[PDB]
From a paper:
HG3.17 was evolved from HG3, a higher-activity mutant (S265T) of the in silico design HG2 that was engineered post-design to reduce the active-site conformational heterogeneity observed by molecular dynamics analysis of HG25. Over an evolutionary trajectory that yielded the HG3.3b, HG3.7, and HG3.14 intermediates, a total of 17 mutations were introduced into HG3 to produce HG3.17, resulting in a catalytic efficiency increase of approximately three orders of magnitude.
In all enzymes except for HG3.17, the unbound state is never pre-organized for catalysis as both Trp44 and Met237 adopt conformations that would prevent productive binding of 6NT. Use of our HG3 crystal structures with or without 6NT as the design template causes similar, but less severe, structural, and energetic effects. To evaluate the effect of restraints imposed by the diffraction data, we generated an ensemble using unconstrained molecular dynamics starting from the unbound HG3 crystal structure, and used it to optimize rotamers for the HG4 sequence. The better predictive ability of the HG3-derived ensembles prepared using crystallographic restraints likely results from their lower deviation from the HG4 crystal structure (≈0.4 Å), which we previously showed to be necessary for an ensemble to represent a physically valid model of the target protein fold. We expect that the structures reported here, especially those of HG4 and HG3, will be helpful to benchmark these future enzyme design protocols.
Residue numbers in the entry:
A (entry chain B), B (entry chain A): 4 to 303
The structure:
C-alpha cells in the first residue's frame, strides 16, 4: 500500500525517495518506486564532483537517465545540491578571485537548471551553509565571494528556471533548542525580507533512535521563517523504529507549509549506514514494521 | 576467508567483482571488496552511454572514481565494454556512413584506453557480437562497417594500450554443444590466424540452477580457440547453489588459460535478478553457503 497516495490524500504533495540509474536497474527498487513513491531525488548524480568534475566538462548521463525515468513513470523530480562545499572538486576550491568564483558558481547553477528547465519541481540551491553554532560556514564561497553569495545564488537560480521552487538545505535542524535551527530561521527571515527568493527550507533528517519526537517541535520552528515550503529531506532513522518514523510523518502533517518527505533510499543494504538498518524496506525488499505503521498513521 | 587469496594460491590471477562509486559508499561493499576480492570491474561507469553521450564529449567522473579507489586499495581493474550495441547512445546508432562510424568507433576506443593507459589489466573490447545460432549479430557496427569492425576494434585497441589484455565477451557460452559456443571458437581462431590481437574470451556466465556442471565442458572448448586467456565474467547463479558455484570454480581451475572469475555484484539485493538470490552474500552481507563451499574447494 502506497504511502505517497495516502499522504497526498492528507493534503501533502509527495512521499519521495532518493535513487539513481543503477538502483533502478537492480533489486526491486523500480517496482517499489512505481507503486509507493511519488517523487525521486538523485542519490549522487547532480552533485558538483559528479556533474562538473573539471571546469566546463559537464557529466549529465546519470541525471539524464533519472529525469527520463521519472517523466516516463509520472513521478515528480527534485535535484541538488547546486552549491555545496562537500564533494566539491579541487578546481573550484582553488579559486581565489572573487569575480571568477562568482561566475563559476553562476555558470554551474545556470547550466544544470537550464538543461532540465520546467521538469524539476525543486532545487536545493545552497546546502550546509551553517556551522553548528549558527554562524555561517566558512567555505570557499563565503571566504571569496562573501555573504552575498547566498543572495546571488538564489537570484541566479530564479532567473535560470522561474518555475522551480528554490530551497536552502541543512542538517542537524532536528531539535528546536539547537542553535543551528534558530539561526537558519533568523537568517532566512532576513534574506526574504530583503527580496532573496528562498521558497523552501529542506531539513536533511538523519536521526538516531528516539530523535523523531524532537522534530515535532523543530519543524514548526523552521516553518516560522515564513517560507512557502518546508520539507523533510533524505530521511533515515537508526533502528527504523515505528515510533520515530511516525513522529516525523506527524510533524509533516502538523505543519501546513510542509510539502512532503523524502527517504534516503529504499532498502536497508543500500543505505550509507546500512548496519543501522535505518530504512523502510529490509534486505529482502519486504516492508518493515515502520512502513506499516506509517500507512496506519496516514489512514487515520 | 578471502576467495581471491585462495584462488591466487592455486595459481590464478584474481577473484573479482563488479562495482561502482555508489556501491563503494553504501552497504558493506567496500569492506568486503577490500578483504575478499582482488579485481574490480565497472558495473556501468565505462559503458558508452555513460562515457560518450554526445559525440567527442567524454564523461569520466564515475570511471575515474573506480580507478582511483582500486589503486588506493591495491586492486586490479578491468574495463568495458568499449564496443557494444546495448546502452548505446542514439547519436551513434543513427550514423550511416562507414568511414564516419569507423572513426567514431576508433575515437571512442582510443580516448578511453589512453586515459587509463597502463592502469587497466584487461578491456572487453567487443561484447555480445554473436547471435544464438552463431552468426554475427546485426548491430549498427556490423551493418554500417561490416564484419571488419571487430578486427578494426582490436587493432585500434592494441595501439592505444599495448599492456592491456584485449577480450571479446559473450553470454550463453555455458554448454559445449550449444551452437554459439563453437561459433565464437571458430571465429576467434580465424581472427587470430589473421593477426587480430584477441588475447581473451570472456564468458559472461549467467546460470540457472544446475547449469554449473556444463561449464566443466564448455570452458575447455572455449580455451581450444588458442587465446592466451579465458575468463569467467559477471558470474551469477539462480539459487546460488554451492554445487553450481563449485563446478564453475573447478572449471576455472581445470583450464590452464583461465585467469580468474568475476562475480556480478556483492550482495543479493543489488543483483539485476535479486529475486533469484544469485550471489555469494545475502541481504545482510553475510556470506552464503556457496561462498563457504568455494573456500573449502579452493583449499582441497
Amino acid at each position: 500500500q502506497s504511502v505517497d497516495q495516502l499522504i497526498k490524500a492528507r493534503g501533502k504533495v509527495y512521499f519521495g525517495v532518493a535513487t539513481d540509474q543503477n538502483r533502478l536497474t537492480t533489486g526491486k527498487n523500480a517496482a517499489i518506486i512505481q507503486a509507493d513513491f511519488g517523487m525521486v531525488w538523485p542519490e549522487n548524480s547532480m552533485k558538483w564532483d559528479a556533474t562538473e568534475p573539471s571546469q566546463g566538462n559537464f557529466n549529465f548521463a546519470g541525471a539524464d537517465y533519472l529525469v527520463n525515468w521519472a517523466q516516463q513513470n509520472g513521478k515528480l523530480i527534485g535535484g541538488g545540491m547546486l552549491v555545496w562545499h562537500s564533494q566539491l572538486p579541487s578546481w573550484v576550491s582553488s579559486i581565489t578571485d572573487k569575480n571568477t568564483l562568482t561566475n563559476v558558481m553562476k555558470n554551474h547553477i545556470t547550466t544544470l537548471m537550464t538543461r532540465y528547465k520546467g521538469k524539476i519541481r525543486a532545487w536545493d540551491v545552497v546546502g550546509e551553509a551553517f556551522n553548528e553554532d549558527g554562524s555561517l560556514r566558512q567555505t570557499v564561497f563565503l571566504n571569496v565571494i562573501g555573504e552575498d553569495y547566498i543572495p546571488i545564488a538564489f537570484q541566479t537560480a530564479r532567473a535560470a528556471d522561474p518555475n522551480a521552487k528554490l530551497y536552502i538545505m541543512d542538517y542537524n535542524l532536528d531539535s528546536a533548542s539547537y542553535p543551528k535551527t534558530q539561526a537558519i530561521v533568523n537568517r532566512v527571515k532576513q534574506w526574504r525580507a530583503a527580496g532573496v527568493p528562498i521558497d523552501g527550507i529542506g531539513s536533511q533528517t538523519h536521526l538516531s533512535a528516539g530523535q523523531g519526537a524532537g522534530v515535532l517541535q523543530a519543524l514548526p520552528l523552521l516553518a516560522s521563517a515564513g517560507t512557502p515550503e518546508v520539507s523533510i529531506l533524505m530521511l533515515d532513522v537508526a533502528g527504523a523504529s515505528p515510533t520515530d518514523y511516525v513522529n516525523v510523518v506527524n510533524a509533516c502533517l502538523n505543519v501546513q507549509s510542509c510539502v512532503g518527505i523524502t527517504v534516503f533510499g529504499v532498502a536497508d543494504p543500500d543505505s550509507w549506514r546500512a548496519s543501522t538498518t535505518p530504512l523502510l524496506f529490509d534486505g529482502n525488499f519486504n516492508p518493515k514494521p515502520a512502513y506499516n505503521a506509517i500507512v496506519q498513521d496516514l489512514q487515520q
